[PDB]
Amino acid sequence: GGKWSKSSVVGWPAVRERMRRAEPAADGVGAASRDLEKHGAITSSNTAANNAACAW
């Protein structure tokens, strides 16, 4: 025989969650060569040895 009042209900708010951390950072060089474009597309002969044409 058994007769006992046993009742249990659960109720909690829940919609959505997106937690993300602990990301490995990359060292060294991680940037677009912006200046390289301006500096590279400005001159033709930079730091060139000797000169065009010669005597004798």
Curated annotation (Swiss-Prot):
GO cellular component: extracellular region; host cell Golgi membrane; host cell plasma membrane; membrane; virion component
Taxonomy, superkingdom: Viruses
Keyword Repressor applies: no
Modified residues (Phosphoserine): S5
The name this protein goes by in its record: Protein Nef
Additional comment: HIV-1 lineages are divided in three main groups, M (for Major), O (for Outlier), and N (for New, or Non-M, Non-O). The vast majority of strains found worldwide belong to the group M. Group O seems to be endemic to and largely confined to Cameroon and neighboring countries in West Central Africa, where these viruses represent a small minority of HIV-1 strains. The group N is represented by a limited number of isolates from Cameroonian persons. The group M is further subdivided in 9 clades or subtypes (A to D, F to H, J and K).
Summary of the function given for this chain in its UniProt record: Factor of infectivity and pathogenicity, required for optimal virus replication. Alters numerous pathways of T-lymphocyte function and down-regulates immunity surface molecules in order to evade host defense and increase viral infectivity. Alters the functionality of other immunity cells, like dendritic cells, monocytes/macrophages and NK cells.
GO MF, one example: CD4 receptor binding
Post-translational modification: The virion-associated Nef proteins are cleaved by the viral protease to release the soluble C-terminal core protein. Nef is probably cleaved concomitantly with viral structural proteins on maturation of virus particles.
GO annotation terms (biological process): negative regulation of glycoprotein biosynthetic process; regulation of calcium-mediated signaling; symbiont-mediated suppression of host antigen processing and presentation of peptide antigen via MHC class I; symbiont-mediated suppression of host antigen processing and presentation of peptide antigen via MHC class II; symbiont-mediated suppression of host apoptosis; symbiont-mediated suppression of host autophagy; symbiont-mediated suppression of host innate immune response; viral life cycle
Quaternary structure and partners: Monomer; cytosolic form. Homodimer; membrane bound form. Interacts with Nef associated p21-activated kinase (PAK2); this interaction activates PAK2. Associates with the Nef-MHC-I-AP1 complex; this complex is required for MHC-I internalization. Interacts (via C-terminus) with host PI3-kinase. Interacts with host PACS1; this interaction seems to be weak. Interacts with host PACS2. Interacts with host LCK and MAPK3; these interactions inhibit the kinase activity of the latter. Interacts with host ATP6V1H; this interaction may play a role in CD4 endocytosis.
Signal peptide: none
Induction: Expressed early in the viral replication cycle.
Might play a role in AP-1 recruitment to the Nef-MHC-I complex, annotated site positions: M19
Family: Belongs to the lentivirus primate group Nef protein family.
Subcellular location per the Swiss-Prot or TrEMBL entry: Host cell membrane; Virion; Secreted; Host Golgi apparatus membrane
Entry comment, domain topic: The N-terminal domain is composed of the N-myristoyl glycine and of a cluster of positively charged amino acids. It is required for inner plasma membrane targeting of Nef and virion incorporation, and thereby for infectivity. This domain is also involved in binding to TP53.
Keywords: AIDS, Apoptosis, Early protein, Host cell membrane, Host Golgi apparatus, Host membrane, Host-virus interaction, Inhibition of host adaptive immune response by virus, Inhibition of host autophagy by virus, Inhibition of host MHC class I molecule presentation by virus, Inhibition of host MHC class II molecule presentation by virus, Lipoprotein, Membrane, Myristate, Phosphoprotein, Secreted, SH3-binding, Viral immunoevasion, Virion, Virulence
Lipidated residue numbers (N-myristoyl glycine): G1
